[PDB]
Amino acid sequence: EWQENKSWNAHFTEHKSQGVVVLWNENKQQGFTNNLKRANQAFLPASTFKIPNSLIALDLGVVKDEHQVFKWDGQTRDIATWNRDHNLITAMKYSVVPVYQEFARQIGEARMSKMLHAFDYGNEDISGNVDSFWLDGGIRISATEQISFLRKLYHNKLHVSERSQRIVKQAMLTEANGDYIIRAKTGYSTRIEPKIGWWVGWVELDDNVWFFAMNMDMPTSDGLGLRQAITKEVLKQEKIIP
Numbered sequence: 001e002w003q004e005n006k007s008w009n010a011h012f013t014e015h016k017s018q019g020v021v022v023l024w025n026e027n028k029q030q031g032f033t034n035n036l037k038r039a040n041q042a043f044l045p046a047s048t049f050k051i052p053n054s055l056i057a058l059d060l061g062v063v064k065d066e067h068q069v070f071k072w073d074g075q076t077r078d079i080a081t082w083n084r085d086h087n088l089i090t091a092m093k094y095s096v097v098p099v100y101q102e103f104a105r106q107i108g109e110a111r112m113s114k115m116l117h118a119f120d121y122g123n124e125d126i127s128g129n130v131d132s133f134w135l136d137g138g139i140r141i142s143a144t145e146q147i148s149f150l151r152k153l154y155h156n157k158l159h160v161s162e163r164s165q166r167i168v169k170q171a172m173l174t175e176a177n178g179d180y181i182i183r184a185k186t187g188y189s190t191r192i193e194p195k196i197g198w199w200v201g202w203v204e205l206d207d208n209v210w211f212f213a214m215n216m217d218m219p220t221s222d223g224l225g226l227r228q229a230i231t232k233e234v235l236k237q238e239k240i241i242p
């Protein structure tokens, strides 16, 4: 069921980094990773939490649809793309934390906790501040656990409406061409050691789906582009994308 392929480590070491890629072949129900241990180590989800957060916000009516505009609060932040109005699509695209912090406040601790348990999401522990627990609270999730959650979302099996799941998968759209579609979400965890980057999602092919979840050491923001680059090198090596 699970196979370890340490040859992928070359893709990390060549960039003087360390991390894990986890792949799941949906048709064959087989998983692949370069590091079985790290594949099952639990990290802060950081902005990958915008997937479950979006689902919950939509299903509870906190977010009406993917067109609703969340006005900039007028507080100048250091990420320029955050200092503007957003909808669900652009808020996902630019990882607009303050928009999702307000979602969490409106969801509230009780419903957030109840929903993460229904999702079987990570350690399901929202201890910490309701508007930041996915950044510096007690919640943790592994790369293999990200896959399990994403597979439920792909199949509309999470305990929210089909509509909520379709909208979030639309908002997860990252890349599409004649060969594949990638739906995914990046993450960047800095408040609790070790600092890491995430990229989780899936690759849709004509006749199969490959789920993926990777995290990697991220001592500075200079390496953030390696999250996608390393994942794609693994995908290319396994002949999943040209």
Ligand SMILES: CS(=O)(=O)Nc1ccc(-c2cccc(C(=O)O)c2)cc1
Residues within 6 Å of the ligand: 047, 078, 079, 095, 097, 186, 187, 188, 221, 224
């Ligand atoms: C480059 S910089 O401007 O020096 N600092 C900086 C840049 C980007 C981010 C960020 C925030 C949320 C999510 C993500 C993500 O990639 O998923 C990235 C944080 C700090």
